[PDB]
């Protein structure tokens, strides 16, 4: 009731403020180092999005006949509920938009230019890592403990939570890429002072590490799979899924060299490292496509379910949903192969295209969380 | 559920957009004739406010043990519900803010300057006077039929609905004052073209009629009272309440002459018409104060109810509410006597102070609708 009403006030405020952000950025300008800005304000946006989308997902799991409780291993007693999570996420969104606007309008307010993002990160960290027993305490400590288990992927036992959150983290890549930039930028120059034109020296470290961070959310994944294979003597599913993440680290590392090889790369076509890159990509894309549509979601049924191409039993009433889902995953998982063309083509360049793309990836992970949980529910009711 | 969620999206959008309006008006400017703008966009704002406040009021009547159904004479079957009304009002608010923003930013969009308000009024009129049988049809036709009965105040029989809505209209004065301006401005110059500097000739008709429109919402009131006295031979309540509205037309007409008398009025103090004006005002204010606090709301009890100064029985749990209410009505009903000082003092001038004040008046009518319905409920349960 009151919570729902809150969630809608903050949603509307988020939408209007995010429009006013984009307007402000297009016309008034994003500051002296727009690039720095974008890199600072990527990660909080995608975390918030991930929040809000898990809240909508929770709602959906409740509305459908899915045992959210069982599969997550959460005490029946405490469940963040799909209004609470959506409240939190919206509140956080309004706070992000406000800090962004402080950002753009630093000089009129008199506030220093880098105070707003670093405030944002302060408030977030305070919320997440709150040692008190106040509201939502059990949720946070569970989230922390699962993230822990994630980050210690090889040695810790794999649960379904570890499943979910490690895949989530592999979706939300750009935070991992941004963290090195934030380190650099705050080691080189402090806030309460602006730029210094050294802020154009962190980017010039071209992310020699980029690949490590880029792969590290897939790495945790990989090591989870190795773990699982160690534990269960069965080798097919987990080894396949491993071999796909191997291909994912391949594509990423090849990649760098395309970009890297500014010598004898004049002509794209030249320097067959790129063509190998391309090819590794399409390979990895179609691999990961096939894997998730066949086992993740169990679609394309041997069991010759009447409903078309799908399993005999569908928790969700609507069948266009799965048809939506298939298309969506197709398009968006292809997005990276599809994505380079613009940069290559002299169209919008650099980081920015990864900014634009990243929310779409998180949304498709959203959808994939729908279908994975559906397929886990329906397996676990099959078994009993 | 979905409605509630909507109501909160549009509420948040309304708040953010109304902030962006005020910013835009302060810095970017409100157009060539700001005065014309203000006069056009007063009335829709106060209608919307009145909508949204009756919706919150409905909510409150439901939450409390008040028979909203009975006293209004509405079929048990159809009741706009405190989410529907609040939806409509919010939707309308977002549309107002958008038209206002089109207004301010006419030249960048290329749209003509006066198209947005006249669109606004089109959409409103289409909604209210919709001859179809689509959603909320019964509500609108009831609203129309009660407004009818209002406007034909002497000859039609008085109900409690006629009560409520006629008092409401006496609150929402500035729409009555604005309608003549809109007539003038659209008789003199049409839209799809801007100003012409004749737009500064309607204001120069200084509202020679102003007093008629100003009094006409109190007039309908007055004639209702006469009606009631005609019907019920009892003469005390209705004659008193009449005599107060008489004083209200006195204050209004005196007033004009203060303003009017630009000759031998240099020195305020001079031209004892003003001092008479003042005095009529304080008189009318304290009259109308006393009337509403003693009979409207039944406070100050002979019946020596323990709860302080109030009746023995209070539907609302909270007693600070009534203590809030008393103060509120005091302050805000005094507002007009209190209000001239600024204009007189060379501080913010003219129409604008009536813009600022008017939402506060509507909010206090809101509160008074609380207490009147409470007092009617508690009388009607007393009787049976």
XYZ file of C-alpha atoms in Angstrom:
768
model
C 0.000 0.000 0.000
C 2.317 2.841 1.291
C 5.306 0.963 0.073
C 3.774 0.504 -3.357
C 2.921 4.128 -3.480
C 6.540 5.053 -2.632
C 7.846 2.724 -5.178
C 5.743 4.547 -7.797
C 6.757 8.069 -6.593
C 10.415 7.157 -6.855
C 9.923 5.412 -10.195
C 8.341 8.426 -11.743
C 11.010 10.622 -10.245
C 13.671 8.328 -11.634
C 12.213 8.427 -15.158
C 11.847 12.247 -15.219
C 15.270 12.733 -13.694
C 17.000 10.299 -16.041
C 15.375 12.271 -19.035
C 16.660 15.517 -17.506
C 20.133 13.918 -17.170
C 20.297 12.928 -20.742
C 19.110 16.399 -21.876
C 21.689 18.066 -19.599
C 24.481 15.828 -20.900
C 23.523 16.474 -24.604
C 23.276 20.209 -24.334
C 24.846 21.685 -21.190
C 27.817 19.136 -21.330
C 29.085 16.493 -18.940
C 32.160 18.472 -17.687
C 35.783 18.867 -18.629
C 36.412 15.019 -18.814
C 33.149 13.522 -20.012
C 34.920 10.253 -20.311
C 35.824 10.224 -16.709
C 32.280 11.026 -15.795
C 30.869 8.224 -17.839
C 33.277 5.695 -16.417
C 32.403 6.907 -12.829
C 28.652 6.769 -13.385
C 28.463 3.543 -15.301
C 28.759 1.119 -12.466
C 26.210 2.565 -10.072
C 23.630 2.694 -12.918
C 24.060 -0.970 -13.765
C 23.959 -1.977 -10.074
C 20.741 -0.056 -9.683
C 19.338 -1.560 -12.768
C 20.228 -4.985 -11.517
C 18.447 -4.241 -8.238
C 15.375 -3.022 -9.805
C 15.279 -5.901 -12.306
C 15.738 -8.546 -9.603
C 12.851 -6.882 -7.777
C 10.623 -7.180 -10.889
C 11.875 -10.720 -11.226
C 10.934 -11.565 -7.723
C 7.526 -10.276 -8.363
C 7.248 -12.440 -11.394
C 8.483 -15.586 -9.443
C 5.889 -15.003 -6.780
C 3.110 -14.385 -9.268
C 3.979 -17.607 -11.027
C 3.992 -20.923 -9.163
C 7.755 -20.854 -8.481
C 9.249 -21.655 -5.135
C 11.735 -18.721 -4.861
C 12.336 -19.823 -1.275
C 13.474 -23.335 -1.990
C 15.795 -23.049 -4.880
C 17.798 -20.006 -3.197
C 18.057 -21.761 0.058
C 16.527 -18.943 2.100
C 14.871 -19.443 5.385
C 11.096 -19.455 4.763
C 11.021 -16.787 7.360
C 12.874 -13.832 5.731
C 12.297 -12.872 2.091
C 12.968 -9.442 0.658
C 9.707 -8.813 -1.036
C 9.256 -7.464 -4.494
C 8.136 -4.060 -3.027
C 11.086 -3.593 -0.705
C 13.677 -4.368 -3.296
C 11.923 -2.119 -5.797
C 11.718 0.700 -3.251
C 15.414 0.376 -2.535
C 16.382 0.317 -6.124
C 14.230 3.397 -6.938
C 15.432 5.371 -4.018
C 18.969 4.631 -5.166
C 18.095 5.628 -8.681
C 16.766 9.008 -7.547
C 20.036 9.486 -5.478
C 22.125 8.574 -8.607
C 20.261 10.968 -10.768
C 20.708 13.774 -8.164
C 24.461 13.092 -7.972
C 24.662 13.100 -11.683
C 22.929 16.414 -11.801
C 25.291 17.802 -9.174
C 28.006 16.581 -11.392
C 26.823 18.390 -14.488
C 25.963 21.562 -12.536
C 28.991 21.574 -10.228
C 30.023 25.181 -11.020
C 26.529 26.760 -10.443
C 26.064 25.019 -7.083
C 29.638 25.762 -6.069
C 30.075 22.240 -5.021
C 33.288 20.558 -6.231
C 33.097 18.604 -9.340
C 34.025 15.128 -8.073
C 32.208 15.202 -4.780
C 28.936 13.859 -6.083
C 30.116 10.480 -7.436
C 32.342 9.893 -4.499
C 29.303 10.646 -2.204
C 27.298 8.236 -4.244
C 29.844 5.489 -3.748
C 29.944 6.343 -0.002
C 26.282 6.024 0.432
C 26.207 2.788 -1.486
C 29.012 1.185 0.406
C 27.519 2.381 3.752
C 24.163 0.742 2.808
C 25.657 -2.543 1.603
C 28.237 -3.018 4.212
C 26.106 -1.872 7.172
C 27.234 -3.594 10.352
C 24.139 -2.600 12.341
C 20.997 -4.751 12.758
C 18.633 -2.241 11.121
C 16.244 -2.816 8.281
C 17.043 -5.459 5.665
C 19.951 -6.710 7.745
C 19.574 -10.434 6.857
C 19.294 -9.780 3.174
C 22.527 -7.781 3.112
C 24.465 -10.292 5.185
C 23.256 -13.128 2.876
C 24.235 -11.061 -0.163
C 27.650 -10.451 1.274
C 28.136 -14.099 2.149
C 27.119 -15.306 -1.368
C 29.320 -12.640 -3.013
C 32.150 -13.957 -0.768
C 31.547 -17.483 -1.902
C 31.532 -16.221 -5.505
C 34.797 -14.417 -5.276
C 36.342 -17.545 -3.645
C 34.929 -19.634 -6.497
C 37.336 -22.681 -6.700
C 37.700 -23.597 -3.049
C 34.044 -22.962 -1.829
C 31.202 -25.329 -2.528
C 28.802 -24.329 -5.366
C 25.161 -23.523 -4.631
C 22.367 -22.345 -6.733
C 22.754 -18.909 -5.282
C 26.394 -19.070 -6.417
C 25.073 -19.943 -9.704
C 22.833 -16.982 -10.027
C 25.052 -14.333 -8.643
C 28.144 -15.394 -10.502
C 26.119 -15.200 -13.783
C 24.788 -11.881 -12.760
C 28.252 -10.553 -12.142
C 29.268 -11.903 -15.633
C 26.476 -9.792 -16.986
C 27.302 -6.706 -15.214
C 30.812 -6.461 -16.628
C 31.447 -2.690 -16.820
C 31.758 -2.260 -13.044
C 34.817 -4.577 -13.035
C 36.331 -2.536 -15.866
C 35.558 0.752 -14.141
C 37.082 -0.103 -10.715
C 40.680 0.157 -12.054
C 39.832 3.541 -13.515
C 38.472 4.826 -10.186
C 41.595 3.584 -8.437
C 43.820 5.331 -10.903
C 41.876 8.517 -10.918
C 41.845 8.767 -7.049
C 45.438 7.793 -6.745
C 46.542 10.415 -9.150
C 44.361 13.390 -8.211
C 41.990 13.881 -5.146
C 38.411 15.607 -5.163
C 37.453 18.996 -4.011
C 39.642 20.030 -6.940
C 38.867 19.431 -10.661
C 40.704 17.551 -13.305
C 44.315 19.038 -13.586
C 44.531 17.546 -17.141
C 46.300 14.513 -15.473
C 42.815 13.036 -15.431
C 43.765 12.434 -19.073
C 46.532 9.920 -18.025
C 44.392 7.108 -16.523
C 42.592 6.512 -19.699
C 45.948 6.530 -21.376
C 46.838 3.599 -19.454
C 44.899 1.537 -21.862
C 43.595 -0.888 -19.501
C 46.671 -3.147 -19.965
C 44.942 -5.178 -17.264
C 41.499 -4.640 -18.983
C 41.485 -8.183 -20.086
C 41.967 -9.611 -16.543
C 39.073 -7.602 -15.114
C 37.029 -8.270 -18.141
C 37.444 -11.990 -17.783
C 37.396 -12.130 -14.012
C 33.535 -12.331 -13.741
C 33.689 -15.226 -16.318
C 36.708 -16.569 -14.323
C 34.676 -17.024 -11.185
C 32.232 -18.859 -13.381
C 34.846 -21.043 -14.789
C 36.294 -21.923 -11.471
C 32.727 -22.760 -10.276
C 32.363 -25.170 -13.057
C 35.745 -26.778 -12.269
C 34.549 -27.120 -8.708
C 31.378 -28.747 -9.704
C 33.123 -31.171 -12.011
C 35.577 -31.983 -9.045
C 32.628 -32.727 -6.835
C 30.225 -34.556 -9.182
C 32.006 -37.175 -11.276
C 29.634 -36.453 -14.221
C 31.717 -34.474 -16.829
C 29.420 -33.379 -19.734
C 27.526 -30.389 -18.527
C 30.076 -28.755 -16.428
C 32.971 -29.458 -18.849
C 31.013 -28.061 -21.792
C 30.130 -25.009 -19.813
C 33.803 -24.612 -18.873
C 34.804 -24.914 -22.509
C 32.469 -22.128 -23.517
C 34.011 -19.878 -20.756
C 37.319 -20.761 -22.138
C 36.191 -19.507 -25.488
C 34.919 -16.367 -23.741
C 38.491 -15.662 -22.334
C 39.755 -16.317 -25.847
C 37.604 -13.840 -27.506
C 38.442 -11.251 -24.866
C 42.181 -11.681 -25.158
C 42.232 -11.965 -28.842
C 40.376 -8.771 -28.836
C 42.820 -6.705 -27.192
C 45.283 -7.372 -29.865
C 43.040 -6.121 -32.614
C 42.723 -2.979 -30.889
C 46.364 -3.270 -29.781
C 48.032 -3.758 -33.029
C 48.069 -0.180 -34.285
C 51.164 -1.310 -36.559
C 50.374 -3.191 -39.776
C 46.707 -2.901 -38.797
C 46.175 0.106 -41.071
C 43.579 -1.787 -43.156
C 41.275 -3.730 -41.064
C 41.194 -6.590 -43.228
C 45.023 -6.727 -42.755
C 46.521 -8.295 -39.691
C 44.589 -11.607 -39.616
C 44.408 -11.458 -35.806
C 41.243 -9.527 -36.302
C 39.699 -11.978 -38.622
C 40.563 -14.600 -35.995
C 38.956 -12.425 -33.407
C 35.819 -12.133 -35.367
C 35.677 -15.770 -35.947
C 36.253 -16.569 -32.260
C 33.566 -14.315 -31.419
C 30.822 -15.712 -33.639
C 31.931 -19.039 -32.332
C 31.637 -18.166 -28.781
C 28.304 -16.362 -29.388
C 26.647 -19.278 -31.104
C 28.120 -21.700 -28.483
C 26.717 -19.726 -25.605
C 23.423 -19.277 -27.420
C 22.892 -22.856 -28.002
C 23.991 -23.729 -24.453
C 21.593 -21.422 -22.637
C 18.555 -22.124 -24.999
C 19.055 -25.868 -24.746
C 19.899 -26.468 -21.058
C 19.323 -23.173 -19.281
C 15.840 -22.772 -20.308
C 15.255 -26.422 -21.542
C 13.634 -25.164 -24.729
C 13.539 -27.212 -27.904
C 12.106 -30.280 -26.407
C 13.003 -33.941 -27.306
C 10.077 -34.780 -25.119
C 8.057 -33.420 -28.138
C 5.898 -31.162 -26.061
C 2.977 -29.879 -28.055
C 3.464 -26.288 -27.205
C 5.810 -25.398 -29.918
C 9.477 -25.906 -29.525
C 9.097 -25.591 -25.791
C 8.661 -28.053 -22.931
C 5.355 -29.866 -22.282
C 4.866 -27.910 -19.075
C 5.112 -24.090 -18.925
C 4.651 -22.291 -15.626
C 4.102 -18.943 -17.470
C 0.707 -18.726 -19.113
C 1.915 -16.863 -22.068
C 3.712 -18.590 -24.834
C 4.583 -15.418 -26.706
C 6.833 -14.816 -23.575
C 9.114 -17.567 -24.440
C 8.961 -16.531 -28.154
C 9.978 -13.040 -26.979
C 12.669 -14.440 -24.870
C 14.259 -16.503 -27.677
C 14.463 -13.510 -30.005
C 15.705 -11.329 -27.208
C 18.516 -13.637 -26.296
C 19.448 -14.056 -29.925
C 19.663 -10.376 -30.587
C 21.331 -9.346 -27.431
C 23.787 -12.052 -27.023
C 24.824 -11.286 -30.573
C 25.099 -7.761 -29.592
C 28.865 -7.750 -29.070
C 29.607 -9.253 -32.572
C 27.051 -6.940 -33.937
C 28.494 -4.050 -31.728
C 31.977 -3.577 -33.183
C 30.712 -2.575 -36.540
C 29.778 0.873 -35.489
C 33.136 1.634 -33.858
C 34.923 0.226 -36.888
C 32.685 2.170 -39.207
C 33.715 5.584 -37.791
C 30.307 5.938 -36.121
C 29.982 6.576 -32.324
C 33.211 5.456 -30.763
C 35.050 3.983 -27.867
C 33.647 3.368 -24.407
C 30.381 5.079 -25.127
C 28.976 2.064 -27.275
C 29.673 -0.233 -24.205
C 27.670 2.298 -22.018
C 24.717 2.098 -24.403
C 24.901 -1.693 -24.726
C 25.422 -2.616 -21.135
C 21.757 -1.917 -19.883
C 20.498 -4.056 -22.723
C 22.732 -6.946 -21.552
C 21.489 -6.560 -17.998
C 17.898 -6.632 -19.265
C 18.420 -9.776 -21.225
C 20.026 -11.367 -18.073
C 16.827 -10.431 -16.415
C 14.898 -12.278 -18.906
C 17.308 -15.251 -18.725
C 16.743 -15.229 -14.904
C 13.110 -15.728 -15.593
C 13.762 -18.699 -17.774
C 16.459 -20.330 -15.795
C 14.407 -20.297 -12.615
C 11.457 -21.571 -14.475
C 13.475 -24.464 -15.839
C 14.941 -25.185 -12.253
C 11.482 -25.058 -10.686
C 10.042 -27.356 -13.256
C 12.991 -29.853 -12.823
C 12.644 -29.795 -9.120
C 8.850 -30.472 -9.285
C 9.595 -33.267 -11.772
C 11.938 -34.820 -9.364
C 9.304 -34.517 -6.628
C -1.912 -2.733 -7.152
C -1.230 -1.602 -10.809
C -3.364 1.416 -10.276
C -1.503 2.327 -7.110
C 1.749 1.884 -8.873
C 0.598 4.230 -11.674
C -0.582 6.737 -9.237
C 2.928 6.790 -7.725
C 4.718 6.983 -11.138
C 2.625 9.972 -12.120
C 3.009 11.588 -8.702
C 6.741 11.434 -8.845
C 6.677 12.685 -12.398
C 4.430 15.536 -11.348
C 6.743 16.586 -8.501
C 9.921 16.495 -10.653
C 8.191 18.248 -13.518
C 6.663 20.959 -11.341
C 10.267 21.626 -9.907
C 11.578 21.818 -13.482
C 8.744 24.263 -14.330
C 9.559 26.567 -11.539
C 13.298 26.484 -12.412
C 12.492 27.161 -16.087
C 10.196 30.061 -15.190
C 12.817 31.637 -12.801
C 15.724 31.430 -15.165
C 14.779 30.769 -18.797
C 11.625 33.077 -18.523
C 7.921 32.477 -18.993
C 7.632 34.190 -22.447
C 6.896 37.627 -23.791
C 3.704 38.076 -21.590
C 4.421 36.202 -18.381
C 1.268 37.640 -17.001
C -0.798 36.111 -19.681
C 0.859 32.802 -19.096
C 0.187 32.849 -15.413
C -3.446 33.747 -15.875
C -3.804 30.888 -18.481
C -2.116 28.290 -16.288
C -3.681 29.197 -12.996
C -7.023 27.570 -13.428
C -5.957 24.147 -14.640
C -3.476 23.898 -11.715
C -6.135 24.609 -9.117
C -8.598 22.197 -10.779
C -5.954 19.515 -10.708
C -5.126 20.268 -7.173
C -8.761 20.047 -6.262
C -8.971 16.649 -7.960
C -6.027 15.266 -6.287
C -7.086 16.624 -2.883
C -10.607 15.197 -3.170
C -8.965 11.871 -4.001
C -6.841 12.046 -0.808
C -9.976 13.088 1.006
C -11.881 10.144 -0.243
C -9.177 7.926 0.959
C -9.353 9.499 4.341
C -13.236 9.125 4.476
C -12.952 5.465 3.647
C -10.172 4.859 6.137
C -12.240 6.497 8.833
C -15.715 5.215 9.699
C -17.519 7.740 7.464
C -20.315 6.800 5.146
C -19.157 8.698 1.997
C -21.935 6.898 0.131
C -24.826 8.088 2.222
C -24.210 11.710 2.785
C -23.423 12.361 -1.097
C -26.420 10.471 -2.190
C -24.529 8.122 -4.505
C -25.769 4.766 -5.496
C -23.944 2.195 -3.330
C -23.025 0.636 -6.583
C -20.707 3.219 -8.249
C -18.027 5.067 -6.272
C -14.942 6.622 -7.802
C -12.325 5.147 -5.594
C -9.474 6.994 -4.032
C -7.027 5.349 -6.538
C -8.946 6.237 -9.674
C -9.412 9.842 -8.772
C -5.766 10.113 -7.761
C -4.652 8.489 -11.016
C -6.753 10.925 -12.997
C -5.529 13.909 -11.147
C -1.852 12.856 -11.529
C -2.151 12.066 -15.156
C -3.648 15.518 -15.629
C -0.873 17.056 -13.615
C 1.798 15.452 -15.798
C -0.128 16.748 -18.931
C -0.246 20.288 -17.369
C 3.402 20.268 -16.611
C 4.212 19.118 -20.200
C 2.049 21.909 -21.655
C 3.697 24.370 -19.410
C 7.064 23.224 -20.573
C 5.965 23.501 -24.196
C 4.925 26.953 -23.309
C 8.268 28.023 -21.919
C 10.203 26.268 -24.710
C 7.900 27.207 -27.593
C 10.676 28.656 -29.804
C 13.080 25.628 -29.510
C 10.343 23.106 -30.339
C 8.990 25.307 -33.111
C 5.559 24.853 -31.800
C 3.485 28.050 -31.500
C 3.474 29.749 -28.239
C -0.224 29.546 -27.326
C -0.952 26.083 -28.601
C -0.060 24.273 -25.417
C -2.568 25.897 -23.026
C -5.305 25.794 -25.560
C -4.535 22.020 -26.052
C -4.658 21.617 -22.337
C -8.088 23.189 -22.143
C -9.198 20.979 -25.085
C -8.150 17.828 -23.448
C -9.769 18.826 -20.201
C -13.056 19.782 -21.718
C -13.060 16.586 -23.873
C -12.532 14.476 -20.692
C -15.164 16.258 -18.600
C -17.806 16.640 -21.162
C -17.408 13.182 -22.742
C -20.701 12.020 -24.215
C -19.575 8.404 -24.637
C -20.171 5.595 -22.101
C -16.472 4.863 -21.512
C -14.624 4.732 -18.245
C -15.811 6.872 -15.332
C -18.951 7.806 -17.234
C -21.308 7.907 -14.195
C -18.968 10.001 -12.142
C -18.695 12.654 -14.851
C -22.423 12.782 -15.516
C -23.081 13.150 -11.738
C -20.448 15.888 -11.554
C -22.036 17.695 -14.437
C -25.504 17.383 -12.962
C -24.402 18.719 -9.518
C -22.446 21.574 -11.158
C -25.682 22.342 -13.086
C -27.677 22.428 -9.908
C -25.005 24.704 -8.406
C -25.034 27.193 -11.192
C -28.880 27.261 -11.013
C -28.617 27.839 -7.259
C -31.900 29.723 -6.374
C -34.464 27.705 -8.284
C -33.035 24.110 -7.737
C -33.404 22.222 -4.503
C -30.317 22.145 -2.204
C -28.534 18.871 -1.463
C -25.488 18.037 0.444
C -23.623 17.581 -2.777
C -24.714 21.129 -3.663
C -23.330 22.097 -0.431
C -19.938 20.667 -1.007
C -19.411 21.655 -4.557
C -20.646 25.185 -4.175
C -18.141 25.645 -1.274
C -15.465 24.105 -3.349
C -16.129 26.489 -6.181
C -15.982 29.395 -3.617
C -12.553 28.135 -2.761
C -11.292 27.810 -6.174
C -11.881 31.446 -7.075
C -9.091 32.219 -9.581
C -10.636 30.136 -12.377
C -13.713 32.431 -12.382
C -11.415 35.456 -12.564
C -9.319 33.917 -15.324
C -12.205 32.949 -17.673
C -12.853 36.608 -18.672
C -9.171 36.991 -19.444
C -9.151 33.914 -21.704
C -12.217 35.223 -23.503
C -10.612 38.567 -24.066
C -7.308 37.186 -25.117
C -8.898 34.771 -27.700
C -11.274 37.355 -28.972
C -8.552 39.821 -29.590
C -5.758 37.654 -31.001
C -5.826 33.915 -32.132
C -2.997 31.195 -31.512
C -0.478 29.870 -33.886
C 0.797 33.443 -33.699
C 2.373 35.122 -30.616
C 1.373 38.123 -28.644
C 1.192 41.187 -31.074
C 1.584 43.500 -28.008
C -2.297 43.725 -28.015
C -2.048 40.908 -25.498
C -1.218 43.888 -23.269
C -4.812 45.299 -23.673
C -6.841 42.576 -21.882
C -5.096 43.113 -18.665
C -5.677 46.783 -19.187
C -9.235 46.165 -19.005
C -8.941 46.056 -15.304
C -11.408 43.470 -14.686
C -14.226 46.073 -14.436
C -16.366 42.959 -14.078
C -13.735 41.352 -11.714
C -15.999 41.878 -8.820
C -18.964 39.998 -10.402
C -16.864 36.929 -11.192
C -15.145 37.178 -7.910
C -18.401 37.127 -6.031
C -20.243 34.744 -8.304
C -18.946 31.544 -6.545
C -20.084 33.144 -3.198
C -23.302 34.215 -5.042
C -24.284 30.658 -5.793
C -23.704 30.031 -2.127
C -25.836 32.861 -1.111
C -28.661 31.900 -3.341
C -28.413 28.329 -1.909
C -28.863 29.671 1.507
C -31.876 31.764 0.421
C -33.310 28.603 -1.058
C -32.826 26.672 2.061
C -34.371 29.369 4.201
C -37.392 29.417 1.680
C -37.794 25.704 2.124
C -37.155 25.204 5.861
C -38.968 27.789 7.969
C -36.061 27.789 10.493
C -34.149 31.121 9.942
C -30.999 31.171 12.175
C -28.436 29.061 10.452
C -29.174 29.824 6.923
C -29.787 33.565 7.532
C -26.520 33.914 9.444
C -24.683 32.122 6.720
C -26.312 34.430 4.163
C -25.271 37.458 6.177
C -21.658 36.371 6.185
C -21.806 35.958 2.328
C -23.213 39.370 2.199
C -20.210 40.617 4.068
C -18.035 38.667 1.620
C -19.598 40.620 -1.376
C -18.998 43.763 0.656
C -15.402 43.210 1.179
C -14.939 42.335 -2.481
C -16.673 45.426 -3.780
C -15.205 47.741 -1.300
C -11.940 46.415 -2.411
C -12.084 47.395 -5.870
C -12.375 50.955 -4.921
C -9.195 50.955 -2.908
C -7.401 49.768 -5.791
C -9.635 51.918 -8.016
C -9.193 55.220 -6.444
C -5.815 56.177 -7.878
C -6.914 59.964 -7.192
C -6.572 61.265 -3.628
C -5.297 57.798 -2.710
C -1.662 58.917 -2.882
C -1.116 58.098 0.819
C -2.669 54.917 1.777
C -3.875 56.077 4.950
C -5.771 58.776 2.943
C -9.040 57.984 1.275
C -10.883 56.287 4.179
C -12.463 53.788 1.766
C -9.420 51.696 2.367
C -9.634 51.825 6.069
C -13.267 50.764 5.627
C -12.103 47.989 3.400
C -9.678 46.761 5.925
C -12.205 46.860 8.606
C -14.782 44.989 6.501
C -12.303 42.457 5.834
C -11.243 41.627 9.384
C -14.917 41.547 10.096
C -15.761 39.150 7.452
C -12.697 36.991 8.279
C -13.510 36.637 11.940
C -17.233 36.064 11.092
C -16.446 33.262 8.711
C -13.900 31.827 11.122
C -16.222 31.625 13.950
C -19.006 30.247 11.732
C -17.057 27.337 10.282
C -15.267 26.395 13.630
C -18.527 26.474 15.550
C -21.058 24.822 13.197
C -19.061 23.405 10.307
C -16.842 21.331 12.337
C -18.894 21.488 15.648
C -15.762 22.248 17.641
C -15.856 24.059 20.957
C -18.373 21.882 22.578
C -21.196 22.991 24.989
C -21.672 19.307 25.496
C -18.375 19.655 27.506
C -16.682 16.769 25.809
C -13.553 15.773 27.643
C -11.328 15.775 24.659
C -10.330 19.332 24.724
C -12.413 21.939 23.074
C -13.745 19.337 20.699
C -16.829 17.119 20.618
C -17.198 14.053 22.876
C -16.953 11.760 19.870
C -14.124 12.018 17.299
C -14.056 9.683 14.318
C -10.347 10.537 13.671
C -8.022 8.907 16.163
C -5.681 11.764 16.314
C -6.488 14.816 18.288
C -3.484 16.791 17.102
C -5.389 16.634 13.698
C -8.080 18.844 14.878
C -5.479 21.071 16.656
C -3.701 21.283 13.280
C -6.883 22.023 11.554
C -7.849 24.926 13.857
C -4.501 26.654 13.383
C -4.598 25.981 9.687
C -7.985 27.521 9.221
C -7.010 30.486 11.337
C -3.901 31.217 9.380
C -5.242 30.606 5.970
C -8.562 32.165 6.235
C -6.737 35.211 7.519
C -4.537 34.963 4.591
C -6.313 37.589 2.492
C -6.170 40.282 5.287
C -2.673 39.222 5.916
C -2.022 39.101 2.059
C -2.402 42.751 1.055
C 0.463 43.885 3.148
C 3.063 42.644 0.791
C 1.528 44.293 -2.282
C 1.098 47.514 -0.334
C 4.619 47.282 0.977
C 6.219 47.350 -2.509
C 7.117 43.659 -2.188
C 5.987 41.075 -4.829
C 3.060 42.589 -6.633
C -0.196 42.171 -8.413
C -1.711 38.900 -9.562
C 1.304 36.860 -8.637
C 0.511 36.968 -4.758
C -3.004 35.513 -5.605
C -1.213 32.693 -7.613
C 0.948 31.852 -4.600
C -1.952 32.040 -2.140
C -4.560 30.182 -4.082
C -3.092 26.563 -3.590
C -2.935 27.251 0.116
C -6.663 28.154 0.116
C -7.502 24.992 -1.785
C -5.499 22.963 0.740
C -7.271 24.457 3.676
C -10.643 23.694 1.917
C -9.366 20.199 1.789
C -8.870 20.157 5.407
C -12.275 21.809 6.003
C -13.801 18.997 3.840
C -12.385 16.559 6.283
C -13.971 18.300 9.192
C -17.276 19.116 7.687
C -17.886 15.537 6.619
C -16.814 14.329 9.961
C -19.278 16.636 11.667
C -22.111 15.528 9.162
C -21.322 11.853 9.711
C -21.342 12.226 13.430
C -24.711 14.163 13.320
C -26.244 11.595 11.107
C -25.145 8.699 13.405
C -26.489 10.710 16.355
C -29.787 10.986 14.697
C -29.741 7.238 14.013
